[PDB]
Design goal:
Elements (H helix, E strand, L loop, with lengths): L3 E5 L4 H12 L5 E4 L4 H11 L6 E4 L2 E4 L1 H9 L3 H4 L11
Helix pairs in contact: 1-3
The structure holds oxidized glutathione disulfide (GDS).
Oxidized glutathione disulfide binds next to α1 and α3.
Family: Belongs to the glutaredoxin family.
Function: Has a glutathione-disulfide oxidoreductase activity in the presence of NADPH and glutathione reductase. Reduces low molecular weight disulfides and proteins.
InterPro entries: GLR_AS, Glutaredoxin, Glutaredoxin_subgr, GRX_bact, Thioredoxin-like_sf
Length: about 90
């Protein structure tokens, strides 16, 4: 399955909204709370160049934060990035 991870901190309505969104999709994912783990969050920042939370990843891709995944969802793209169901229209 895809490796889906959302990095969060406490006191962050954007993080929890984003977590609830990912929970509503039924996907398997990890919420990683780095409120007090500055080294873990430094590794995350080195990759993305953002110092805010949440930061959401699917495999190697940084999808972005709360605004970005909500926008992707409104566009119908979020489901695709989370590796949800693939459809095929078979034509005779
Ligand atoms: N009370 C505020 C919002 C509620 C709230 O609790 N806000 C948070 C910050 S926004 S939540 C934390 C914030 N996230 C962001 O700003 C990410 C926004 C981006 N647009 C996205 O879509 O993800 C962030 O990372 N900031 C940078 C940093 O912390 O260094 C807070 O004040 N926490 C209190 C505390 O920390 O004690 C309001 O109504 O305006």
């Amino acid at each position: 399955m895809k490796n889906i991870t959302i990095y969060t901190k406490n006191y962050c309505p954007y993080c929890k909204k984003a977590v609830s969104l990912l929970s509503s999709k039924g996907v398997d994912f990890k919420e990683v709370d780095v409120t007090h783990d500055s080294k873990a969050f430094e590794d995350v920042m080195a990759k993305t160049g953002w110092d805010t939370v949440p930061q959401v990843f699917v495999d190697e891709e940084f999808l972005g934060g709360c605004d970005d995944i909500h926008a992707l969802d409104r566009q119908g793209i979020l489901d695709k990035k989370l590796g949800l169901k693939l459809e095929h229209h078979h034509h005779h």
